[PDB]
Design a binder for these strands. Structure first.
Ligand SMILES: [Ca+2]
Ligand SMILES: [Ca+2]
Ligand SMILES: [Ca+2]
Ligand SMILES: [Ca+2]
Ligand SMILES: [Ca+2]
Length: 222
DNA sequence: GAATCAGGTGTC
């Protein structure tokens, strides 16, 4: 009832959610969704099965206005994952062709460029948020698969860059990449300033990012 | 789908 209630009062309402807070590699992805038609079975995203999420997606993209926003591994390393997530969400809102007057954002502590409110477990209280969580996850899983193709030695298509045993194995065996979040503890502990300087000289990371991670390596660790 | 192992970080 959330959505409809908020629509009476505010007009165009979008639901916003992100995917990729907790992984070790790749961008964080956010989606903003405005939806008027009914879509049955929207219940969350991490609550669903991959087969299902693909089914609801096809219907969500038929019936809903969607905006997708991304913040890169560099932005995560420089701004932290909270601020990177906020940025991806604000970018999702900009990418929505329909301009929302109010937003419902999954989680808490988040104020976007559009006035709205935060719902803990929003993904299971709101259909709009539930839809956004599906779009976010699916779209990001698509990007991650694309990386596996770019980095054949890494099973990105399976673990989606999260800290699974297999992913950690691949990092030790194959080495840290620029798409890893170099500020994240497990990646940071396998890094050397040697490889970091190599990334920089090859131009694979920015100076600002080089500088930040070099400082973190030094602080590693008391 | 739900339990229950694993393992990332931010707000307060
Ligand atoms: Ca989510
Ligand atoms: Ca969320
Ligand atoms: Ca949740
Ligand atoms: Ca610093
Ligand atoms: Ca395991």
């Amino acid at each position: 009832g959330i959505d409809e209630l908020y629509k009476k009062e505010f007009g165009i309402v979008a639901g916003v959610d992100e995917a990729g807070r907790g992984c070790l590699a790749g961008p964080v992805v956010a989606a903003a969704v405005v939806l008027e038609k009914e879509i049955e079975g929207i219940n969350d995203s991490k609550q669903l099965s991959p087969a299902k999420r693909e089914r609801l997606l096809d219907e969500i993209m038929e019936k809903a206005a969607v905006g997708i926003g991304i913040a890169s591994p560099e932005e995560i390393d420089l701004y932290n994952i909270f601020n990177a997530t906020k940025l991806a969400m604000n970018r999702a809102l900009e990418n929505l062709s329909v301009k929302p007057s109010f937003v419902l954002v999954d989680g808490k502590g988040i104020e976007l460029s559009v006035p709205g409110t935060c719902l803990v477990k929003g993904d299971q209280k709101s259909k709009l948020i539930g839809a956004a969580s599906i779009v976010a996850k699916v779209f990001r899983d698509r990007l991650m698969s694309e990386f596996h193709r770019m980095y054949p030695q890494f099973s990105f298509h399976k673990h989606k860059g999260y800290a699974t045993k297999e992913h950690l194995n691949e990092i030790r065996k194959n080495g840290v990449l620029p798409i890893h979040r170099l500020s994240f503890e497990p990646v940071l502990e396998l890094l050397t300033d040697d490889l970091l300087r190599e990334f920089f000289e090859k131009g694979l990371i920015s100076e600002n990012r080089f500088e930040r991670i070099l400082n973190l390596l030094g602080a590693r660790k008391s």
